[PDB]
Amino acid sequence: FKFEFKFE
Amino acid sequence: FKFEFKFE
Amino acid sequence: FKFEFKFE
Amino acid sequence: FKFEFKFE
Amino acid sequence: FKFEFKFE
Amino acid sequence: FKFEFKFE
Amino acid sequence: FKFEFKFE
Amino acid sequence: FKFEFKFE
Amino acid sequence: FKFEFKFE
Amino acid sequence: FKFEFKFE
Amino acid sequence: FKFEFKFE
Amino acid sequence: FKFEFKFE
Amino acid sequence: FKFEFKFE
Amino acid sequence: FKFEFKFE
Amino acid sequence: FKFEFKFE
Amino acid sequence: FKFEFKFE
Amino acid sequence: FKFEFKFE
Amino acid sequence: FKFEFKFE
Amino acid sequence: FKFEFKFE
Amino acid sequence: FKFEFKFE
Amino acid sequence: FKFEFKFE
Amino acid sequence: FKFEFKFE
Amino acid sequence: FKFEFKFE
Amino acid sequence: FKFEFKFE
Amino acid sequence: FKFEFKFE
Amino acid sequence: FKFEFKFE
Amino acid sequence: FKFEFKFE
Amino acid sequence: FKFEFKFE
Amino acid sequence: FKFEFKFE
Amino acid sequence: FKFEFKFE
Amino acid sequence: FKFEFKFE
Amino acid sequence: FKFEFKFE
Amino acid sequence: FKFEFKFE
Amino acid sequence: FKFEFKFE
Amino acid sequence: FKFEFKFE
Amino acid sequence: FKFEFKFE
Amino acid sequence: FKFEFKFE
Amino acid sequence: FKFEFKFE
Amino acid sequence: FKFEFKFE
Amino acid sequence: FKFEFKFE
Amino acid sequence: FKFEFKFE
Amino acid sequence: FKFEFKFE
Amino acid sequence: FKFEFKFE
Amino acid sequence: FKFEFKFE
Amino acid sequence: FKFEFKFE
Amino acid sequence: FKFEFKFE
Amino acid sequence: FKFEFKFE
Amino acid sequence: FKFEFKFE
Amino acid sequence: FKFEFKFE
Amino acid sequence: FKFEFKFE
Amino acid sequence: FKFEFKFE
Amino acid sequence: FKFEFKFE
Amino acid sequence: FKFEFKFE
Amino acid sequence: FKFEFKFE
Amino acid sequence: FKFEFKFE
Amino acid sequence: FKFEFKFE
Amino acid sequence: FKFEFKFE
Amino acid sequence: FKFEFKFE
Amino acid sequence: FKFEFKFE
Amino acid sequence: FKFEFKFE
Amino acid sequence: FKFEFKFE
Amino acid sequence: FKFEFKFE
Amino acid sequence: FKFEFKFE
Amino acid sequence: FKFEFKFE
Amino acid sequence: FKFEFKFE
Amino acid sequence: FKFEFKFE
Amino acid sequence: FKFEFKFE
Amino acid sequence: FKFEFKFE
Amino acid sequence: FKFEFKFE
Amino acid sequence: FKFEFKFE
Amino acid sequence: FKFEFKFE
Amino acid sequence: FKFEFKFE
Amino acid sequence: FKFEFKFE
Amino acid sequence: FKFEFKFE
Amino acid sequence: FKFEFKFE
Amino acid sequence: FKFEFKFE
Amino acid sequence: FKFEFKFE
Amino acid sequence: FKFEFKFE
Amino acid sequence: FKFEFKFE
Amino acid sequence: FKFEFKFE
Amino acid sequence: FKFEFKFE
Amino acid sequence: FKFEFKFE
Amino acid sequence: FKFEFKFE
Amino acid sequence: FKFEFKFE
Amino acid sequence: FKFEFKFE
Amino acid sequence: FKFEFKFE
Amino acid sequence: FKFEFKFE
Amino acid sequence: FKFEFKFE
Amino acid sequence: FKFEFKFE
Amino acid sequence: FKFEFKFE
Amino acid sequence: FKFEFKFE
Amino acid sequence: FKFEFKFE
Amino acid sequence: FKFEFKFE
Amino acid sequence: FKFEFKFE
Amino acid sequence: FKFEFKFE
Amino acid sequence: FKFEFKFE
Amino acid sequence: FKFEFKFE
Amino acid sequence: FKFEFKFE
Amino acid sequence: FKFEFKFE
Amino acid sequence: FKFEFKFE
Amino acid sequence: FKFEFKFE
Amino acid sequence: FKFEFKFE
Amino acid sequence: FKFEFKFE
Amino acid sequence: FKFEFKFE
Amino acid sequence: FKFEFKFE
Amino acid sequence: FKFEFKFE
Amino acid sequence: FKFEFKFE
Amino acid sequence: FKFEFKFE
Amino acid sequence: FKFEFKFE
Amino acid sequence: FKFEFKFE
Amino acid sequence: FKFEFKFE
Amino acid sequence: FKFEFKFE
Amino acid sequence: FKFEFKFE
Amino acid sequence: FKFEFKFE
Amino acid sequence: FKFEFKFE
Amino acid sequence: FKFEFKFE
Amino acid sequence: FKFEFKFE
Amino acid sequence: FKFEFKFE
Amino acid sequence: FKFEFKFE
Amino acid sequence: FKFEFKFE
Amino acid sequence: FKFEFKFE
Amino acid sequence: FKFEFKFE
Amino acid sequence: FKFEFKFE
Amino acid sequence: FKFEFKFE
Amino acid sequence: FKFEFKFE
Amino acid sequence: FKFEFKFE
Amino acid sequence: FKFEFKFE
Amino acid sequence: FKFEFKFE
Amino acid sequence: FKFEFKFE
Amino acid sequence: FKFEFKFE
Amino acid sequence: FKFEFKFE
Amino acid sequence: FKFEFKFE
Amino acid sequence: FKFEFKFE
Amino acid sequence: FKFEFKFE
Amino acid sequence: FKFEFKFE
Amino acid sequence: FKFEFKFE
Amino acid sequence: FKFEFKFE
Amino acid sequence: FKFEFKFE
Amino acid sequence: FKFEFKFE
Amino acid sequence: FKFEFKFE
Amino acid sequence: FKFEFKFE
Amino acid sequence: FKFEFKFE
Amino acid sequence: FKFEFKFE
Amino acid sequence: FKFEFKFE
Q1: For residues CZ8 and CU8, is the Cβ–Cβ distance under 8 A?
Q2: If we measure between CA atoms, which residue out of CC1, AG8, AA2, B8 comes closest to residue EM8?
């Protein structure tokens, strides 16, 4: 399982 | 306002 | 899986 | 008011 | 997949 | 009141 | 695909 | 009461 | 495609 | 009561 | 295409 | 009770 | 095209 | 703002 | 069971 | 900021 | 039951 | 920073 | 029972 | 459009 | 579009 | 009972 | 779109 | 009782 | 989209 | 009582 | 998205 | 009373 | 996302 | 009273 | 994530 | 009064 | 995780 | 007054 | 886990 | 004033 | 109180 | 008070 | 008070 | 006050 | 005050 | 004030 | 003030 | 002010 | 001010 | 200002 | 300012 | 600014 | 600034 | 900045 | 900066 | 910087 | 820097 | 640096 | 103990 | 006991 | 005891 | 002890 | 005692 | 002692 | 006494 | 002594 | 006395 | 002596 | 006197 | 003498 | 006088 | 004379 | 005067 | 003359 | 003047 | 002239 | 192991 | 293992 | 494994 | 494995 | 082991 | 694997 | 694999 | 072991 | 793979 | 051992 | 050992 | 041993 | 030994 | 021995 | 020996 | 011997 | 011998 | 012999 | 695009 | 993007 | 993409 | 990405 | 991916 | 990643 | 992975 | 990792 | 490691 | 290990 | 190692 | 070991 | 080694 | 792993 | 060993 | 070796 | 041995 | 060897 | 408010 | 032992 | 042991 | 409000 | 162990 | 309201 | 273990 | 209302 | 494991 | 109402 | 895994 | 009402 | 995966 | 009522 | 993918 | 009642 | 795409 | 009852 | 209004 | 298990 | 109105 | 177990 | 309004 | 399993 | 009215 | 056990 | 599996 | 507003 | 009326 | 698979 | 036990 | 009336 | 695939 | 605002 | 009456 | 026991 997030 | 999402 | 969002 | 959406 | 929205 | 929609 | 709406 | 609709 | 409506 | 409709 | 309606 | 209709 | 109706 | 997640 | 997290 | 978790 | 944790 | 836990 | 109704 | 009804 | 009703 | 209603 | 109502 | 309502 | 209401 | 409301 | 309200 | 509100 | 409010 | 607010 | 507020 | 705030 | 605040 | 804060 | 603060 | 702090 | 009008 | 209108 | 209009 | 509009 | 528009 | 729009 | 748009 | 959009 | 978009 | 997005 | 995305 | 993400 | 991710 | 993660 | 992870 | 971990 | 672990 | 451990 | 009453 | 009366 | 009166 | 009243 | 009045 | 009032 | 007025 | 008011 | 006004 | 106000 | 304003 | 203000 | 502003 | 301010 | 600012 | 500041 | 800063 | 500082 | 028994 | 039993 | 039994 | 049984 | 019993 | 049995 | 059985 | 009994 | 059997 | 009893 | 009794 | 009693 | 009595 | 009494 | 009395 | 009294 | 009286 | 008195 | 294939 | 497949 | 397979 | 499978 | 298997 | 299984 | 088995 | 099991 | 057991 | 047994 | 036991 | 027995 | 006993 | 068994 | 007996 | 006894 | 008796 | 006795 | 008690 | 008490 | 109690 | 209790 | 209790 | 209980 | 209980 | 239970 | 239960 | 269960 | 269950 | 189940 | 089930 | 299933 | 199923 | 299926 | 299916 | 299908 | 109940 | 009910 | 029930 | 209820 | 209750 | 029902 | 049921 | 209630 | 039913 | 209560 | 059923 | 049915 | 309450 | 069925 | 049917 | 209470 | 069927 | 309260 993998996950990645970016904001701004 | 900017957003990003990654899954799998 | 990929996702991208923009507001404004 | 502006919006954007991206998928896949 | 693409999407775009405008209001006002 | 004004509206817009884009798809594809 | 395109869409447009007006009210008033 | 006034209305408008656009498609395609 | 076009559309127009009036009421009243 | 009054009504109107336009198409095409 | 055109349309018109009256009631009353 | 009164009615009206227009077409074309 | 024309149309008219009365009741009563 | 950056984020990451791993599971399994 | 395994887990991993990253921030920044 | 880094994190880790193990279970079982 | 077992558990393990790491930080930094 | 390191941690450990055992139960049962 | 009893009943009564008027329209128009 | 008057109505009258009796039951029983 | 008037209405009249009586019960009982 | 009694009842009454008007539209338009 | 006017409305009128009476009960009892 | 009594009731009244207007739209538009 | 105006509204009017009276009770009692 | 009394009531009033406007939208748009 | 303006709003107007009055009570009493 | 009185009330007022604006969005956007 | 602006807001405006008045009471009384 | 009075009120005001801005986001983003 | 900016914020603005005024009261009174 | 007055208020102001920034995140991130 | 920066913060900014002003009052008065 | 004034305020400021940093984490991490 | 660093911290920074300023007041006034 | 000023402030500073470190953990770990 | 139905009314049909077929033309064809 | 229905009203049917076929045209084919 | 229905009204149908079939064209086909 | 329904209004039907078929076109096929 | 419904309005349907079927095309097919 | 509903408005239906079928296209198939 | 609903609005449906079915395509299929 | 709802807006429905079906596509199948 | 809802907006639904069903695809299937 | 909700926004629904179904895909199945 | 909600946003739902259902896939299934 | 909520964001829902269902996957089943 | 919530974010939900339901898988099931 | 909450983040929900359901898995069942 | 919360983070929930529900498995069940 | 909370971190929730449910397992049932 | 909390950490919860619920099992049940 | 709290650490919660529920088991029921 | 129902009682149906159709008109049209 | 059920009772229908369909006039049309 | 139930009572329907469907006008249309 | 219901009482249905349909119009349309 | 319940009372419905559905106009449409 | 309810009283339903549908419009549409 | 309860009172509904659903417009749509 | 409630009073419901739906719009949409 | 309670009063709801749900717009949507 | 409540007063609900929903939007969406 | 209580007053809610839920936008969503 | 409360005043609720939800956003989301 | 109390005042809430919940953003989420 | 409180003032609540939630974020999340 | 009290003032809360809960971020989460 | 308090001032609360929650984070988490 | 009191000031809290609770991080968790 | 206090100043609270919680961590956890 | 259901069982229905409708009489009417 | 359903079992239906109609009697009218 | 359904089973219906209609008598009428 | 349905099984229908009509008797009239 | 449900058991349904309708009477109208 | 249906099976109907009509007697009348 | 349907199977019809009429007897009258 | 449910049991329903509907009369109407 | 239908099969009808009419006797009468 | 539930027991339902509807009367309308 | 529940027991419901709905009248309406 | 609950006991429900609805009246509307 | 509960007992509920809802009137509306 | 609770006793509930709702009135709306 | 509780007793609740809700009016609204 | 508690006694609850809500009024809204 | 408690007694609560909530108004709102 | 307590006595509670809430007003909001 | 919709596609049916009915075999029977 | 549906695909129907009937058999019987 | 949706796919049905109805056998009966 | 659904897949329906009916039998009966 | 969702999968149904309805047998009846 | 669901899997439905109906029987009846 | 979720799994339902509904028997009825 | 759920497993539903309905009966009825 | 839960285990639900409903009856009714 | 948790275990529920809800009878109703 | 809990054990729930509901009745009602 | 914990044990609940809730009767209601 | 607890033992709960609720009544109501 | 969760497990439900609902009988009704 | 602890023992509760809550009657209400 | 406690023993709780609640009443209310 | 401890013993409580709380009446309220 | 205590003995508690609450009243209220 | 009389009381009576006996132990042992 | 024995006990006795009077209030008021 | 033994226990006894009287109220009122 | 008599009570009786025996343990052991 | 053993237990016994009487009310009323 | 008699009770009987045995454990172990 | 073992368990036993009697009511009434 | 007798009960019997055995585990393990 | 093992389980057993008797009612009535 | 006997029950039997075995897992694993 | 394995599973087994008996009713009645 | 016997049941048998095996997974994996 | 694999699956197996027996009824009756 | 035996069942057999294999996926993948 | 692949699929397989047996009944009876 | 055997079944076989392959996709893609 | 591709498809395949076998019955019997 | 074999089947074969190809699209696109 | 009158009511009477018996059990056992 | 015996039951009785009286109404009116 | 009268009612009577027996089980077992 | 005996019960009684009176209303109005 | 009047009410009366009897138990036992 | 035995059952009985009486009405009227 | 009379009813009787047997199972097993 | 006897009870009484008066309102209005 | 055996069944019985009696009516009237 | 008036209220009256009696017990015993 | 009489009925009898057998399966297996 | 065997079946039986009796009527009258 | 006697009670009284007055409001307004 | 008699009936008999066999399959397989 | 084999079948049988008997009547009378 | 006024209030009055009597006991005994 | 007799019937027999064979397929394959 | 007598009481009084005045507010505003």
Answers
A1: yes
A2: CC1
Closest chain BP C-alpha to BO6 CA, distance in angstroms: 4
The minimal CB distance from DX6 to the residues DY1, DY7, DY8 is found for: DY1
Query: Which of DM1, CZ4, CL2 shows the shortest CA–CA distance to CT6?
Result: CZ4
User: Are DI1 and DK4 a contacting pair, CB within 8 Å?
Assistant: no
Give the closest-approach CA distance of BF7 to chain CE in angstroms: 21
- Maximal CA-CA distance, chain CP: 23
CB atoms inside a 10 Å sphere around CB CC4 = 10
3-state class of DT3 per DSSP? strand
Residues ≥6 apart with Cβ < 8 Å to AO3: AN2, AN3, AN5, AP2, AP3, AP4
Give the contacts of AN5 (CB within 8 A, at least 6 positions apart): J5, AM5, AO3, AO4, AO5, AO6
C-alpha atoms less than 13 angstroms from C-alpha of EK5 in its C-beta half-sphere: 15
Which residues from chain AX sit within 8 angstroms of residue BQ6, using beta carbons? none
Instruction: Compute CA distances DD5 → CV6, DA5, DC5, DH7, DJ4, whole Å.
Output: 33, 15, 5, 20, 25
| Burial tier of AI1 (Cβ tally within 10 Å: 0-12, 13-18, 19+) | middle
Angle of CA points BH6, BH8, BI6, to nearest 5°: 35
Question: How many Å apart are CA BW2 and CA BV8, to the nearest integer?
Answer: 19
Method underlying the structure: cryo-EM
CB contacts, 8 Å: AU7 with chain CP: 1
| Cβ-nearest to CY6 among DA1, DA3, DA6 | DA6
Token digits for CM8? 């029977």
| AV8's tokens | 């089943």
Q: Could you give the CA distance from residue BC2 to residue CB8 in angstroms, rounded to a whole number? A: 6
How many angstroms separate the CA atoms of BO6 and BN7, rounded?
6
Whole-angstrom distance between the N-terminal and C-terminal Cα of chain EB? Answer: 24
Q: Which of CU2, CU6, DS5, DS6 is nearest to DN7 (CA)?
A: CU2
In angstroms, the CA BJ7 to CA BI4 distance is 11
Q: Could you write out the DSSP letters of every residue in BJ1-8?
A: -----EE-
Six-digit token string for AF8: 């991130």
Q: How far is CA2 from chain CO (nearest CA, A)?
A: 7
Distance CA BR8, CA BQ5 (A): 11
Do EK1 and EM2 meet the contact criterion of CB atoms below 8 Å apart? no
The residues, any chain, with a CB within 8 Å of residue U3's CB and separated by 6 or more, are S5, S6, S7, V3, V4, V5, V6
Alpha-carbon torsion AR2, AR3, AS1, AS3, what sign? positive
- Rounded to 5 degrees, φ, ψ at DB5 are -145, 100
CW2/CX3 Cβ within 8 A = yes
Q: Tokens at residue BD8, please?
A: 């049309």
The pair of structure tokens assigned to DO2 is 């394995």
Which residue in this structure is represented by tokens 């019955």?
Answer: DU7
Written as six digits, the tokens of AZ4 are 């929730």
Residue with tokens 């299937």: AS8
Token look-up 């036990």 returns EI1
Residues of CO1-8 as b/e, b for ≥16 C-beta within 10 angstroms?
Answer: ebbbbbbb
Cβ contacts (< 8 Å) between AO1 and chain AP: which residues?
Answer: 1-2
Alpha carbon distance BV2, CR8 (integer Å): 6
Structure tokens at Y3: 């509204």
- Tell me, in Å, the resolution of the deposited structure: 3.4
Least Cα distance to P5 among Q8, N7, Q5, R3 occurs for Q5
Chains DH and AH are in contact, defined as 3 or more C-beta pairs closer than 8 angstroms: no
